Amino acid sequence: AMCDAFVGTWKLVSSENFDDYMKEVGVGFATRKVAGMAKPNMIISVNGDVITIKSESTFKNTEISFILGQEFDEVTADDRKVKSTITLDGGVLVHVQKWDGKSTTIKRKREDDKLVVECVMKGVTSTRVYERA
Numbered sequence: 001a002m003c004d005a006f007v008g009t010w011k012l013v014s015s016e017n018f019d020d021y022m023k024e025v026g027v028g029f030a031t032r033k034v035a036g037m038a039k040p041n042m043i044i045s046v047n048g049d050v051i052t053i054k055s056e057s058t059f060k061n062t063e064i065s066f067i068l069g070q071e072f073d074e075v076t077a078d079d080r081k082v083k084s085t086i087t088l089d090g091g092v093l094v095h096v097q098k099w100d101g102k103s104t105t106i107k108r109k110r111e112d113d114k115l116v117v118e119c120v121m122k123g124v125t126s127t128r129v130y131e132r133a
């Protein structure tokens, strides 16, 4: 599959504006401070139509498994109970989370040897760059 580009184990190497993104999402002070320190690994695997994305860190471990285009329940690292849908749009994994009348969009894409994750809440964008572990 094309989703091959994404499979593997990735380590966070840089972050920009994540604190600001988390504020916009509504994450509280203490969670933001601890989550912001974390250097998670992101583990992406595919088994048939099922994609699994795991985040492993000192703060929280999370795991989502899904089929493209099929809405699912997700409890996020900051304990939001959200409705998520993930699609593959021109090679970019696009993940939309809906909760309490709010929405955020997280895009995962390959750029050179990096996996670039861009998170947007209203106007506030954060960029998280990962390299292969």
Ligand SMILES: O=C(O)c1c(N2CCCCC2)nc2ccc(Cl)cc2c1-c1ccccc1
Binding pocket: 022, 027, 031, 032, 035, 036, 038, 039, 040, 055, 056, 057, 059, 060, 061, 062, 076, 077, 078, 106, 117, 119, 128
């Ligand atoms: O890395 C994450 O999976 C990730 C995340 N994802 C990934 C990119 C940011 C937006 C969606 N969104 C978050 C939203 C709010 C909070 Cl408190 C944490 C996260 C974390 C996260 C950060 C550090 C350790 C563990 C999990």
